[PDB]
């Protein structure tokens, strides 16, 4: 049953790509002040779950949902900017830059590991196809 490794590692690659994309989106908007609806940008993060249907022992990984990060919104005193609060408290995203950079590095490394898994699995499948010949 080496074919299931294709599904497992492909799901892992897709999930790590989504996680890296979300981390990069958070990082690129660390300095944002406004959203499309006027709301401040809220740092977002993916949720990883075991991609196993009920009764399946072990599977790959899947992104359940994207959730707003739990952290206080960064308050900035600029009661001159057109966007402000009642007391001039501009709300800026709660992005932790170090966390996002480490997340990007971790996602890249896990991605590369899954690529190696896929490569060696394909090599083994070819061998196996050269079983008796």
């Amino acid at each position: 049953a080496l074919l299931n490794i294709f599904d497992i590692a492909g799901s892992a690659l897709a999930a790590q790509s989504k996680r890296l994309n979300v981390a990069a989106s958070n990082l690129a908007n660390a300095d944002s002040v406004t959203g499309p609806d006027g709301q401040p940008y809220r740092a977002k993060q993916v949720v990883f779950q075991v991609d196993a249907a009920p009764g399946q022992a072990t599977g790959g990984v899947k992104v359940a949902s994207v959730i707003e990060s739990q952290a206080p919104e960064k308050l900035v005193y600029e009661p001159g900017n057109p966007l402000a609060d009642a007391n001039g408290y501009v709300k800026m995203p709660n992005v932790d830059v170090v966390g996002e950079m480490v997340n990007t590095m971790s996602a890249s490394r896990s991605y590369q590991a899954n690529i190696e898994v896929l490569n060696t699995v394909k090599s083994m499948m070819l061998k196996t196809l050269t079983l008796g010949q």
């Binding site: 932790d96 966390g99 480490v102 971790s106």
Partner: protein
């Protein structure tokens, strides 16, 4: 592979401590002000082996 997360936690909390210190320094002229102390606590992760 998880020492990177220990070091990242250390760097992020160093940033937080620096933010506290900068906030304290910004109020060097604030009348009747009390400086906020800062201390790095160590949290040991309790697994089974080491």
């Amino acid at each position: 592979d998880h020492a990177i997360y220990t070091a990242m936690g250390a760097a992020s909390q160093t940033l937080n401590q620096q933010a506290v210190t900068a906030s304290n320094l910004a109020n060097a002229s604030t009348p009747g002000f009390r400086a906020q102390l800062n201390a790095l606590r160590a949290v040991p992760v309790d697994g089974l082996s080491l």
